[PDB]
Design a protein around this ligand. Sequence first.
Ligand code: BCB
Ligand code: BCB
Ligand code: BCB
Ligand SMILES: C/C=C1/c2cc3[nH]c4c(c3C)C(=O)[C@H](C(=O)OC)c4c3nc(cc4[nH]c(cc(n2)[C@@H]1C)c(C(C)=O)c4C)[C@@H](C)[C@@H]3CCC(=O)OC/C=C(\C)CCC[C@H](C)CCC[C@H](C)CCCC(C)C
Ligand SMILES: C/C=C1/c2cc3[nH]c4c(c3C)C(=O)[C@H](C(=O)OC)c4c3nc(cc4[nH]c(cc(n2)[C@@H]1C)c(C(C)=O)c4C)[C@@H](C)[C@@H]3CCC(=O)OC/C=C(\C)CCC[C@H](C)CCC[C@H](C)CCCC(C)C
Ligand SMILES: CC(C)=CCC/C(C)=C/CC/C(C)=C/CC/C(C)=C/CC/C(C)=C/CC/C(C)=C/CC/C(C)=C/CC1=C(C)C(=O)c2ccccc2C1=O
Ligand code: HEC
Ligand code: HEC
Ligand code: HEC
Ligand code: HEC
Ligand SMILES: CC(C)=CCC/C(C)=C/C=C/C(C)=C/C=C/C(C)=C/C=C\C=C(C)\C=C\C=C(/C)CC/C=C(\C)CCCC(C)C
Ligand SMILES: CCCCCCCCCCCC[N+](C)(C)[O-]
Ligand SMILES: CCCCCCCCCCCC[N+](C)(C)[O-]
Ligand SMILES: CCCCCCCCCCCC[N+](C)(C)[O-]
Ligand SMILES: [Fe+3]
Lengths: 258, 323, 273, 332
Amino acid sequence: MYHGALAQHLDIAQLVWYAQWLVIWTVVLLYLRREDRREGYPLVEPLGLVKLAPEDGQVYELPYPKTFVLPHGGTVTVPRRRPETRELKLAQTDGFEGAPLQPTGNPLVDAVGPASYAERAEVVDATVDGKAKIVPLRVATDFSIAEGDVDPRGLPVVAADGVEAGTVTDLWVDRSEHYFRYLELSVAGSARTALIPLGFCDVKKDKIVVTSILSEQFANVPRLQSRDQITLREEDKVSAYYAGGLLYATPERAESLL
Amino acid sequence: ADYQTIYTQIQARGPHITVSGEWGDNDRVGKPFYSYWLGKIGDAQIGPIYLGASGIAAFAFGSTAILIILFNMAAEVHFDPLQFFRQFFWLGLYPPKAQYGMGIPPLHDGGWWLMAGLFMTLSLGSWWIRVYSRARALGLGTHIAWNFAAAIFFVLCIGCIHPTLVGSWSEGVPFGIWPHIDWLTAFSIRYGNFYYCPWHGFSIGFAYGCGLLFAAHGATILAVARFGGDREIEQITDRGTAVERAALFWRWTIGFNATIESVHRWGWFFSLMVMVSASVGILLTGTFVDNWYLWCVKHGAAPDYPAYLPATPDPASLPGAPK
Amino acid sequence: ALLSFERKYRVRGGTLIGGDLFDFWVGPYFVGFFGVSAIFFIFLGVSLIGYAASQGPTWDPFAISINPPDLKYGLGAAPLLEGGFWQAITVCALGAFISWMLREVEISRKLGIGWHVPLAFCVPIFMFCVLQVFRPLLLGSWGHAFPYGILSHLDWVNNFGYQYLNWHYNPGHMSSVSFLFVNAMALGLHGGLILSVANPGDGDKVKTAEHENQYFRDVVGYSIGALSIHRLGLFLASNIFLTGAFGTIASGPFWTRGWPEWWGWWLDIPFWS
Amino acid sequence: CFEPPPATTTQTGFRGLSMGEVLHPATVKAKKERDAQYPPALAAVKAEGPPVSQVYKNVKVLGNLTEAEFLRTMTAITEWVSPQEGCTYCHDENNLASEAKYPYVVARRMLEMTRAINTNWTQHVAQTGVTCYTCHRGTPLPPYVRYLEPTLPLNNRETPTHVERVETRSGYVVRLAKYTAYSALNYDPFTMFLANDKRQVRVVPQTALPLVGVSRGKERRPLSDAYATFALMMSISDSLGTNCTFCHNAQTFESWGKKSTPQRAIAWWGIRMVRDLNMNYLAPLNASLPASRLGRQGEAPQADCRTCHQGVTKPLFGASRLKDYPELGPIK
Ligand code: BCB
Ligand code: BCB
Ligand code: BCB
Ligand SMILES: C/C=C1/c2cc3[nH]c4c(c3C)C(=O)[C@H](C(=O)OC)c4c3nc(cc4[nH]c(cc(n2)[C@@H]1C)c(C(C)=O)c4C)[C@@H](C)[C@@H]3CCC(=O)OC/C=C(\C)CCC[C@H](C)CCC[C@H](C)CCCC(C)C
Ligand SMILES: C/C=C1/c2cc3[nH]c4c(c3C)C(=O)[C@H](C(=O)OC)c4c3nc(cc4[nH]c(cc(n2)[C@@H]1C)c(C(C)=O)c4C)[C@@H](C)[C@@H]3CCC(=O)OC/C=C(\C)CCC[C@H](C)CCC[C@H](C)CCCC(C)C
Ligand SMILES: CC(C)=CCC/C(C)=C/CC/C(C)=C/CC/C(C)=C/CC/C(C)=C/CC/C(C)=C/CC/C(C)=C/CC1=C(C)C(=O)c2ccccc2C1=O
Ligand code: HEC
Ligand code: HEC
Ligand code: HEC
Ligand code: HEC
Ligand SMILES: CC(C)=CCC/C(C)=C/C=C/C(C)=C/C=C/C(C)=C/C=C\C=C(C)\C=C\C=C(/C)CC/C=C(\C)CCCC(C)C
Ligand SMILES: CCCCCCCCCCCC[N+](C)(C)[O-]
Ligand SMILES: CCCCCCCCCCCC[N+](C)(C)[O-]
Ligand SMILES: CCCCCCCCCCCC[N+](C)(C)[O-]
Ligand SMILES: [Fe+3]
């Protein structure tokens, strides 16, 4: 007689094998794949004439809503309907639904394609104790640049066209993570300052090189409502602007690389 | 390129911050110091650290375990200091070589091994409590502790549950660098090649899966660091262009995508399954399966190949063959 | 057919080659030139696998095996059924992986994000080449590569290991295993951490970045940081293969003995022998 | 600590299973040269006259040989075993029938053992056979022998370090490791499997599920048995300068048929032959050898796979002298 035997050709291990696959597929399909749909669903499609009947499938693929209790008040529930009413300066290049869109104006200013920003809340991201998280050093008095690293203040900013476009006046630090996220510069020939994400800055000892956009384009960088604060949406607006340059700074950037 | 994703060009220094816990705030010890070079790729601050009862209990039990192991290893080289450092890797504390069934083995043949195992176990349980407690103290979910529990369970399976299930302490895992390694082959050989153990395969699938996932997730976040993708928490409570782009990169590539929060659920799951699958595999071994290869052959899953050199009959089964 | 926030990102541009010719989507899938070449190689590869398997002795998924040629064929072409198929399939595999990789680059450019993912994806492709191309070239025969079979490839791994008495003592392997293990652990920790902060339980408030720092400073005395752990994860996973490749390439071409004996350079130093 | 390419590789299994030898050319040639020192066969002599059983006085084994043949054999024996010492190593300069010197009686038993090997263990030595040289390699004391405890160096012609001395307890692990291809396996495969036929090498179950009656508690063989078998196999591999795939398809170590090579069955017979040599020829020699030859337990030096093979799949790369010295077997 054998341990694990249950019949002519049936044993314990064999049964557990089936159970294991069942557990895996159940967790993957019924749980994880639904959690994957707490953002962006239901999917969308250009309505034709008469079509407003919610398919059963749109209900089945979604999980029950969950609600996040925010640390500084309020709540967020997902999933939830979040259509984007904001007009988009884009036009269809061809007829089929899989065709790419093409900007109709200035993609950097119109904020489309890689220049697009999310509809984040117009609220200042906060620290655990309630203060503004991302602020310039002129404000974050107790914060400094570690000894050994370049102090960008006073240094010039050179754009992709090699032209100097401004002078760095300050650094914005993340008071929650002790980390610099933006540089503030005075824009040449303009009565405005602009922020630039550090990830778009090649920090040299004698200059700050920026290849994402041309000097002329620093003029249209999104502006902040305040001088010493920035909202989650502004952060997205500012970051998206430069990312947009990667593809739109010049006519050839969007065309085939090779 | 984004140099920030490689290292931190300009480091920042600021006041030491502390988040108060529901308790033990006065148990944090050490003065925080900063490392400039560390700050190039991580946070520059080192310490302070939290002590606590469970934490201290852990080091105490753990230290006892280690001493039992080191002393026995030292005995192996007749306490010669130079030979000890030389032969370290080859030294070990072994479980009973003789078959005593489930009987407590004599100190010289399994006794000390069992004792060390006991103290290691206590050390792990104590550390588990610390991992669990700190989360509670800080008002955090206990997801880490539950993942940690799966790993501890696996250790217990190869450590003493499987030995108990078959009734022999001899099956335990030795303490030592090469020795715990040698056990892997001894075990696989005894149980008919672990490659044919479905749960070994599942575990590997998930282990390899973790490599795939952290590589992809890690790369995904660096790719969107310019949009604050690293600030995952608020990207969860308030979707930013960072995760919209992350999701689309993946949807456009493989046809589907996760959310910034769910991708962590997938990661957590894959990680947990490496240990859960491994445990199930061990629990079934010896208990209900003696030879995994034959088990696969029995269910017609094993591949077969033509002979290259002539097929060789077992000489032992030939007529007149010696014993 | 579109995520609620997707349309604004679906613009033209970002390709490496092809331009507007293949710059479009089919369902949620971006195509591009490399999507076309990818499908081409996949279709081709799968066709070869099906045809080769049909010539085989079984249709059972676990037993099907398409093997490389005998060592005697060296680096030359082998007859279809005797390794030729394996050779053709290997080429299609390579074509499909590299296309897939290059396709991710086009997707990255279009979205204005870093190219880190395709870069990361090069690591597993590299390892495939070490096993199937480089090592076989150094040993002089395609016959040293692994077979395409769900279980048969495990048999190859198995014998390969044992050809060096005990593969566990291979130092490149020791490093590889360590990274595999650390990475799995770190992913669980990172996954768990993020979930524990956004899902505290009951009706408590979502926590913060400061809480993440506090948790690990308390538990292990150090907090590496949010962006850093992602950089570390990519590093730990990539090194599973980057370091492992050394242990693989070394076996045969640079070491023909058992791996344990390799440790003699240490054990046999005259000073303590 | 690496070996420069190219590497010589053979195939011993179906394409794609990665089964085969992996050799470093320099090493193979160095062994070929060492083994090439095998003295050539002495010129054949015409059998003329009466059998030495009549001619000489104390010939118990080679008595059927004529005087010329017999002396030819003594010359070969001297060249294989004691070339440096000469005939007087086993003989009294003034009486060739005297058994006064121990090498004499030992050599007599050895003549029997050798003839036994070439006659009764044909399943292993085939038509290649062995001669005194196979093991002795020109010295009374064979370079590769084993005592009841691991000794270092493996080649006794080498001078031991203090630590390698069997008396030095702190060197035990290394002595064991060097005998098991450097592994850390805490078992000595010689005393366990080759000195006698007490233990069973196989440890792998022959059924998919655990048979009730032998799978629980004290009914089970301890896992230590598996480590031991592995150690034996490491030892065997290093002794022939080969790897596991030379005999097994690792897919299933316990299977024969297509899962094993002819070489595995030959090795199987080698194990039986080695046990026979140790139990019935070498071990007993402790009663006829000086204490200086015995081990710490009064055991006579014994043989293992290396004793003959010395790191080559075939001793002396297959060289044979069987037809040149039929007196050594096979005996009809
Ligand atoms: C020749 C022998 C073989 C073998 C034998 C083997 C065995 C015997 C076992 C595995 C198992 C496993 N194997 Mg296999 N294996 C694996 C991969 C794997 C893993 C996925 C899995 C173990 C999971 C793990 O993370 O352990 C690493 C993680 C561990 C040990 C948990 C750590 C927990 C943590 C609490 C520890 C904390 C430590 C404290 C600091 C310690 C302090 C101590 C002090 C106090 C003394 C691969 C990828 C391959 C390949 C490519 O060939 C392979 C081949 C083989 N394995 C061979 C066929 N393997 C296991 C399995 O899945 O069985 C089904 C198993 O038991
Ligand atoms: C040097 C060591 C090697 C190794 C060692 C290894 C071990 C020891 C084990 C596996 C296992 C597995 N391996 Mg192998 N392997 C496989 C694929 C596979 C899967 C059948 C399975 C689980 C994969 C997984 O979850 O990973 C992580 C990836 C995930 C989670 C994403 C999903 C991947 C998907 C499952 C892949 C499915 C592949 C298909 C079966 C066939 C693909 C071709 C088709 C489309 C024509 C591929 C595709 C390749 C290639 C192309 O290089 C490869 C190379 C190698 N494996 C190396 C030769 N592999 C395990 C197994 O169960 O074997 C049966 C196992 O035990
Ligand atoms: C007896 C033999 C053994 C052995 C033999 C062995 C060998 C011979 C090798 C390893 C290697 C490795 N082993 Mg070891 N091993 C490992 C772990 C590991 C890995 C870390 C490492 C790399 C695996 C690899 O190359 O994947 C390869 C995976 C690839 C190439 C994936 C390619 C994916 C591809 C790019 C895309 C595929 C796409 C699909 C086809 C798409 C399908 C689409 C569908 C899903 C829609 C562990 C944890 C253990 C344990 C616990 O014992 C172990 C034991 C052993 N190994 C045994 C002792 N091991 C390798 C190494 O690095 O050694 C240093 C190696 O060469
Ligand atoms: C799939 C998921 C997996 C997974 C998961 C997870 N893994 C976790 C967690 C999760 C989720 C945790 O939450 C927990 C943790 O906390 O993370 C920060 C943890 C951990 N995983 C560790 C090791 C690890 N994980 C491995 C594997 C996997 N993990 C798998 C892959 C492996 C492998 C690969 O072998 C290893 C080696 C430890 C670092 C840690 C436990 C600490 C402990 O339990 O120690 C207990 C305490 C001691 C040993 C104390 C004694 C120590 C000292 C130095 C002795 C001093 C002696 C001296 C004489 C004293 C006097 C000195 C004198 C000067 C005065
Ligand atoms: C160190 C870092 C690691 C790492 C990293 C990353 N991994 C990535 C990415 C990153 C970063 C991606 O961006 C890319 C992706 O998109 O993610 C979803 C990807 C992917 N990782 C896959 C499989 C995977 N990753 C493995 C390992 C690691 N990944 C390691 C751990 C393993 C192991 C361990 O076995 C597997 C099996 C695919 C799912 C996917 C590519 C599919 C493809 O290429 O599409 C194009 C190709 C096809 C759809 C099929 C082509 C079939 C050919 C023509 C015919 C068959 C040939 C074949 C050789 C037969 C084999 C048979 C088999 C039984 C022997
Ligand atoms: C019909 C046709 C042939 C058309 C032509 C066009 C064309 C080129 C089509 C391609 C068709 C093909 C070949 C499809 C197969 C695609 C493949 C390879 C699918 C494999 C999917 C697998 C098995 C992935 C393995 C990893 C895994 C288990 C992932 C699940 C979780 C996900 C979705 C992770 C990805 C993911 C990660 C890693 C993040 O970090 C992240 C961060 C923030 C938001 C989202 C994400 C996110 O989605
Ligand atoms: C030990 C290894 C020996 C060496 C070296 C030589 N001889 Fe020997 N010899 C040996 C034995 C055990 C025997 C007995 C053979 C038997 O079948 O029983 C002998 C015998 C002889 C004899 C016969 C003497 C007699 O019985 O009258 C002769 C003549 C003889 N040996 C000669 C001889 C010479 C000249 C040698 C060197 C060339 C020589 N022997 C070496 C063992 C050994
Ligand atoms: C390996 C299988 C052997 C073959 C074949 C022959 N000999 Fe041997 N011999 C062998 C061993 C392991 C030993 C024991 C250790 C020892 O050196 O005593 C010996 C010993 C002898 C001796 C005595 C050596 C001494 O101590 O001075 C002699 C003289 C001897 N062997 C002779 C001899 C002859 C003539 C052989 C062929 C007929 C022969 N040996 C074969 C192992 C092996
Ligand atoms: C031929 C020269 C061999 C080499 C090289 C290796 N093995 Fe072997 N092995 C061989 C034989 C003749 C036997 C049977 C012994 C007997 O007395 O019947 C074995 C057996 C094993 C086993 C046990 C199989 C069983 O039925 O339980 C194992 C697990 C094994 N061998 C493993 C193994 C490994 C890992 C090797 C390289 C280190 C190896 N073998 C080499 C002959 C030969
Ligand atoms: C001398 C008395 C031997 C001892 C002790 C062992 N072997 Fe041997 N082996 C010996 C000879 C003369 C031969 C014949 C060679 C020939 O040409 O046929 C062999 C051969 C083998 C083989 C065959 C290898 C091949 O290429 O075919 C193997 C695999 C082998 N021997 C294994 C082996 C093992 C494992 C031993 C210890 C248990 C062993 N041999 C001892 C002589 C002697
Ligand atoms: C009491 C009763 C009735 C039953 C108890 C049953 C019980 C719960 C038993 C449990 C047994 C268990 C869990 C055993 C498991 C053992 C396992 C899995 C061990 C595995 C591997 C061990 C290894 C690798 C460790 C070896 C040891 C070391 C390297 C020594 C320690 C070294 C250091 C601390 C570093 C020192 C550095 C310094 C010299 C500079
Ligand atoms: C690592 C994978 C090992 C082989 C696993 C093979 C599948 C399990 C065995 C077959 C189970 C199903 N069956 C044949 C009963 O239908
Ligand atoms: C060890 C094997 C683990 C297999 C895990 C498979 C995970 C990927 C499943 C993707 C399913 C996708 N989809 C869109 C069909 O739901
Ligand atoms: C063994 C696990 C295999 C998982 C294979 C998953 C294939 C998924 C193919 C893309 C699915 C696309 N989608 C979601 C749009 O339908
Ligand atoms: Fe993350």
